[PDB]
Every structure is written in C-alpha cells, then in structure tokens.
Amino acid sequence: KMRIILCDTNEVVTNLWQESIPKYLCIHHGHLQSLMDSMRKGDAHSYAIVSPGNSYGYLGGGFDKALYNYFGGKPFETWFRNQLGGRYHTVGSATVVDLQRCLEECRDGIRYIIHVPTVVAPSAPIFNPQNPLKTGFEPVFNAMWNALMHSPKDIDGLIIPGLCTGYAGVPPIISCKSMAFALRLYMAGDHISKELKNVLIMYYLQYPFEPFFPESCKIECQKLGIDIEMLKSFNVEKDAIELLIPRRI
Amino acid sequence: KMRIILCDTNEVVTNLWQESIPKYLCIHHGHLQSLMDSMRKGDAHSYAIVSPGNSYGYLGGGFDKALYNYFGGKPFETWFRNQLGGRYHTVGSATVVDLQRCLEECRDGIRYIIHVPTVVAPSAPIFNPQNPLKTGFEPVFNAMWNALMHSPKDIDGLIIPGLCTGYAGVPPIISCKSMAFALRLYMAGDHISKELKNVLIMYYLQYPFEPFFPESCKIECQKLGIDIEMLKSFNVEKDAIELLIPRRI
Numbered sequence: 439k440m441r442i443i444l445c446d447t448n449e450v451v452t453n454l455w456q457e458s459i460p461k462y463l464c465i466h467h468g469h470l471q472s473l474m475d476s477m478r479k480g481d482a483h484s485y486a487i488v489s490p491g492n493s494y495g496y497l498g499g500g501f502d503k504a505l506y507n508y509f510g511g512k513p514f515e516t517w518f519r520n521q522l523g524g525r526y527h528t529v530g531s532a533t534v535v536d537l538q539r540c541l542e543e544c545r546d547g548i549r550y551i552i553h554v555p556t557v558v559a560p561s562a563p564i565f566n567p568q569n570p571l572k573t574g575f576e577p578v579f580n581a582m583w584n585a586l587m588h589s590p591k592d593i594d595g596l597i598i599p600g601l602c603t604g605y606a607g608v609p610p611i612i613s614c615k616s617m618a619f620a621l622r623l624y625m626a627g628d629h630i631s632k633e634l635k636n637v638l639i640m641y642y643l644q645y646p647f648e649p650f651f652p653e654s655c656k657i658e659c660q661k662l663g664i665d666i667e668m669l670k671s672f673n674v675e676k677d678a679i680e681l682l683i684p685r686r687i
Numbered sequence: 688k689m690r691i692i693l694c695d696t697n698e699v700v701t702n703l704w705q706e707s708i709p710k711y712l713c714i715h716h717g718h719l720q721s722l723m724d725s726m727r728k729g730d731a732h733s734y735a736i737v738s739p740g741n742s743y744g745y746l747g748g749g750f751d752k753a754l755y756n757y758f759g760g761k762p763f764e765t766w767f768r769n770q771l772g773g774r775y776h777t778v779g780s781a782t783v784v785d786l787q788r789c790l791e792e793c794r795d796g797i798r799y800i801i802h803v804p805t806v807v808a809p810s811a812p813i814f815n816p817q818n819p820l821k822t823g824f825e826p827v828f829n830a831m832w833n834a835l836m837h838s839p840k841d842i843d844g845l846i847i848p849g850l851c852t853g854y855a856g857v858p859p860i861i862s863c864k865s866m867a868f869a870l871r872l873y874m875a876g877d878h879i880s881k882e883l884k885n886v887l888i889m890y891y892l893q894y895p896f897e898p899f900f901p902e903s904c905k906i907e908c909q910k911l912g913i914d915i916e917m918l919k920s921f922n923v924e925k926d927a928i929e930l931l932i933p934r935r936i
C-alpha cells in the first residue's frame with residue numbers, strides 16, 4: 439500500500455522514469471520544495487525520504503542540499519550526523535533516521551530519512567564507462583534495494599531522487615534502468631518467491647552462478663513464463679527487464 | 688578488552704599479519720578446526736566469527752566451507768540463510784547471527800557469526816589490477832571495519848580470516864595492509880577522535896575532500912604528530928600506515 443514518489447530536477451531522469459515504470463507511483467519534475475508544495479493541496483500522512491549521499495552524512499550537492507535547506511541547514515546536518523553516530527558508514531549500508539525527535543525543526547509529514555551512502559566522499563565520479571555494471575548498474579540497484587528493504591512499514595510514501603546521477607556521474611539511462619528493475623521486483627510482491635528474486639538479481643547484475651539457482655526456482659520460472667535461457671545470459675546493456683519480470687506478474 | 692584472532696590457512700597471509708600488526712591479538716596458521724583445537728587447552732569464553740562470503744549467505748569456498756563443516760553442514764546453512772531472511776544482502780552490509788538459538792547444533796564457545804558479504808556470488812574474482820584501490824584496498828577495509836563495528840560488545844574474542852584472498856583474488860599484500868589499517872584505527876581507541884578517524888579513512892581510501900577535514904581535526908593531527916601534508920597525499924600503494932597512525936598512539 440506504500441506509494442513510491444520519484445523526484446528529480448532533471449527532466450531527462452523524470453522522462454525515462456515515465457517510460458520505464460509499468461496512484462502507487464508518482465513522478466515529480468522539480469525540486470523537493472516543489473514536491474512538498476504540490477502534495478499539500480492534497481495532504482488535507484507519513485513519509486520517508488531517501489538521502490543517497492556520502493559515507494559521513496554530510497548533506498551537500500544536489501538532492502541532499504535540498505534536504506539540508508528544507509530541514510534547517512547546518513544545525514540540522516550536525517544533528518543528522520550525530521544520529522548516524524558521527525562515524526564512517528560503508529557504501530552498501532543503510533540507516534534509518536527518525537525525525538520524530540524534532541517534536542521533543544519539525545517539517546511536514548516527513549518522518550524518516552533513509553541514509554543510503556553511494557560514495558565515500560564526492561571527490562570524484564563513481565561511474566566509469568569501462569565497467570558500467572560495477573560502477574553504474576550495480577551501485578544504483580543496491581542503493582534502491584536498500585532503500586526499499588529499509589523503508590519503515592508504517593509510511594504512506596517513499597520519496598526517492600534520481601540515484602547517483604549527480605556528481606556520481608552515473609548516466610540517467612543506466613540509473614533509471616536499475617531503479618526500474620528494483621521497483622519491478624518490489625512491486626511483484628509475493629507473486630515471485632524470495633528465492634527466485636535472489637536469482638533474478640544475481641543474473642541481472644551479471645554474477646551467473648548455477649549452484650545458487652535451485653531446481654525449485656527453475657520450476658517457478660516455467661510457471662511464471664520467465665525464459666530460463668534468456669535469464670542465464672541476461673545482458674543489462676542489451677536486454678529488457680521485462681524478460682526477467684513479465685508484466686503479467 | 689576484546690581479543691582479535693586472525694586465522695588463515697595461507698602462511699603468506701599469516702606471515703604478513705605478524706609483520707604488520709604492532710594477548711590482545713593472536714595469529715593462527717591453519718584451519719578453523721585447528722584454532723578451536725588449540726584454544727580448548729586454555730578454554731578451561733564467548734566468541735564471534737566473521738563470515739565474509741556472498742550476498743546470499745551460502746557457505747562454500749574457503750573459510751566459510753570450514754564454518755559450514757564445523758557447524759553442521761547443509762542443515763546449518765539452511766538455518767543460517769533463514770536467519771538472514773533468505774534474501775539478497777548488499778556488499779557493504781553486515782548482519783550478526785546469534786547461534787544461542789542452537790540451545791533451544793551448538794558448537795563450542797562460538798556464539799555469533801557476523802555475516803559480511805564481500806561478493807554477490809563467486810562467479811569471478813572481485814580484484815582487478817587496473818584499480819587496486821576500488822577492487823582491493825577498499826573492499827577489504829570495508830569488510831574489516833564492518834566486522835569491527837558490528838562485533839557484539841559481550842564477546843571475549845573475534846575470529847577473522849584473510850579477507851577476500853580466496854576466490855575474490857585480492858593479493859595478500861593488499862588485503863593484509865587494509866586489515867592492518869582497520870585494526871590500527873580500532874586499537875587506537877579514544878586516543879583519536881571519531882572525526883579524525885573519519886578523515887584518516889577518507890585519505891587512506893583516496894577520496895581527498897577538504898570540506899570534510901575540519902579545523903578541529905587539523906589541530907588534533909598536530910597534537911598527535913600526524914603529518915598533515917603526507918596525510919593529504921597519502922598513497923596506500925607507497926606509504927606506510929604508520930604515517931597515519933603513529934605507534935606512539
């Protein structure tokens with residue numbers, strides 16, 4: 439019942455989202471303030487917002503700078519980093535910060551910030567055209583998966599920006615595809631077993647390893663209309679994610 | 688007061704550990720069973736063991752295969768994966784599994800397994816000589832940092848293998864250096880502020896970003912005898928970690 443709210447100032451990103459995403463989903467072109475201003479005319483709700491910044495919790499750059507300004511600036515950033523323990527958080531981790539404490543500064547119905555670091559520090563882009571998978575498709579998928587897996591069950595909606603497309607340098611076409619795959623897996627719900635979802639992620643990320651593909655899952659693929667041969671050779675740079683998750687599901 | 692127990696079957700790894708590590712630390716050359724057999728003559732204690740495997744919790748390969756055999760084989764692996772929720776865990780995350788449940792199968796004083804995935808699946812090495820930092824120094828440091836940060840405070844000792852040196856392919860010389868840096872940071876305790884440790888990690892991993900290097904930390908460097916210029920240009924491939932953390936600390 440959770441609503442997914444995709445928000446980005448780059449029309450390139452928002453257009454791609456519209457084209458890739460099969461109400462349950464909202465796409466907003468503009469800044470965070472713009473999104474909050476438009477949701478107010480209908481907020482007459484609890485939300486979590488994804489902060490895909492750095493390993494230290496500093497809030498600068500693109501989307502995070504917006505959160506920085508929206509929640510109170512420097513004093514807020516200081517409070518935020520302290521909630522994160524003021525220490526180094528590895529890329530691939532996720533930490534939920536409860537803003538409820540503000541009531542004890544508070545701002546709208548946004549109660550949680552899900553900290554999902556995508557870079558140690560923004561000293562350079564993370565993307566490298568030499569290996570799009572390892573530095574593009576994978577990091578964006580992981581950040582999206584983490585955001586979804588750590589989203590508090592009590593929220594009405596999850597606000598997410600165009601992951602790693604800022605200083606990080608991941609091309610929007612790449613970022614949006616991984617974000618779409620993570621969302622398709624999520625929206626599939628229980629229609630796909632937890633184990634088959636594990637297998638789909640494995641092949642999507644190009645880590646083909648048969649021993650981790652149980653017979654029960656092959657049986658499920660046939661039942662679901664998922665072509666096992668195309669799955670085993672899935673190439674994210676050439677194949678449609680629809681092959682992995684038929685819209686029928 | 689926690690004891691660090693480094694264990695590896697590769698004498699190359701164990702020798703390097705002895706040379707790099709400044710009782711509080713034990714180095715064992717041999718298999719896990721060998722370590723447990725030798726600790727018994729003195730266990731007349733609670734331990735956590737690091738399992739640096741894959742994103743799915745399967746226990747195969749090197750060190751994990753030893754844990755697999757030690758705890759009960761297939762039935763144990765199945766129980767283990769279920770404790771992990773049976774889902775995909777991103778590299779960079781860490782999950783503590785409590786074996787205490789066995790009492791409700793049980794094996795020695797090992798109460799916890801800290802799951803620290805280092806690869807999605809072992810379909811190929813993670814290391815690439817073209818970028819030793821991103822595929823060698825960084826992943827090993829992150830896995831060690833995660834293991835240390837998630838170690839239950841109630842244990843007497845932490846058992847850790849030669850991280851990412853198996854199928855992963857990280858050279859022992861590289862893996863041991865990052866493991867030594869993480870340990871030096873940890874052993875420094877409160878002698879180095881949490882914020883300066885953040886800065887040291889940043890430069891060690893080669894993400895030089897001045898805005899994240901506060902004046903208070905520069906002041907602390909001078910007090911501690913940490914050369915700020917050598918810090919700003921620290922090159923893990925050429926400089927000694929002693930520059931970052933003088934043994935005086």
Ligand SMILES: OC[C@@H](O)[C@H](O)[C@@H](O)CO
Pocket residue numbers: 446447448451490499500501502599600601602603604605
């Ligand atoms: O991490 C997401 C980035 O911050 C984006 O919001 C860019 O600033 C603009 O596409």
Ligand SMILES: OC[C@@H](O)[C@H](O)[C@@H](O)CO
Pocket residue numbers: 695696697700739748749750751848849850851852853854
């Ligand atoms: O992850 C650590 C690896 O499993 C090692 O134990 C190798 O098997 C041997 O150096």
